[PDB]
Amino acid sequence: ITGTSTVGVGRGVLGDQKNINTTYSTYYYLQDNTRGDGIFTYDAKYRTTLPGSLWADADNQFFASYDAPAVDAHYYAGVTYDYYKNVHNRLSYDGNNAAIRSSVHYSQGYNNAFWNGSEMVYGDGDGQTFIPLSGGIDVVAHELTHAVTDYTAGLIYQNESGAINEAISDIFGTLVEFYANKNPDWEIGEDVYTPGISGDSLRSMSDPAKYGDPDHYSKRYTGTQDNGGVHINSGIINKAAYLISQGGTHYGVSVVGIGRDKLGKIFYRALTQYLTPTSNFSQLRAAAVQSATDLYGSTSQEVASVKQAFDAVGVK
């Protein structure tokens, strides 16, 4: 919509108050003109027709409980935009400042969030397994990272390339959580998962096996469920990324940690310069080794740690 850029205030899903970039034209709309070609948040109104209506508010105040999921979808899209821009010099998900669009209140009791090829979509959860999914910065950045992958490597969402596509999203969702720096960790979705149970999440990168996911190639899932295990086998790659960053000894193989910033640089370069639609795990290892070599040199600690981390998870 055409109007002036304004600044609203509201509360997110977890009750935290934040400022949001809005646009004024009769109503105040959730349209942030300060990043690229805009961030636009829409109301799906408990339906599944997308995108729904661009979110309109009479007073630029967003404190109703109905407002909260939209507050977070809009705000965390902006944090994720800033991360790619400031850290990777990437402008929006296509690298050319594509508008970021998100719809909230999708369906009823919908326990999921996803990138549908054109936009973000967040369920409200059923109140038991999940609260509104946009309350988790790692969920928002995970799903927006699928948009980044779709425009770069284009890793096919099936078998090994699919599990890489999933892992990349867990990695950058986690790195966005650390960048924003509010209670960061190596688990996925903890802020919105199971309001009755402390300390759980959907997945762990530091210990994938905590939730039944393989942490070594010898344990890969080889069946047909979950598109050949894209959410299951990502654990192998998540554990390798965790080891590259943090270090540790995993099945007797020691890895020297190089930190989050270098992990992010190595995997961003692999993503955008080396991976292709059909890349398998062993090709990811080569891309990550070539990436670390370009960035740090072939004799570097960085290259050696990458090689160690993939050895530790059984990937040659």
Ligand SMILES: [Ca+2]
């Ligand atoms: Ca209002």
Ligand SMILES: [Ca+2]
């Ligand atoms: Ca956290």
Ligand SMILES: [Ca+2]
């Ligand atoms: Ca997390």
Ligand SMILES: [Ca+2]
């Ligand atoms: Ca919980």
Ligand SMILES: [Zn+2]
């Ligand atoms: Zn995903």
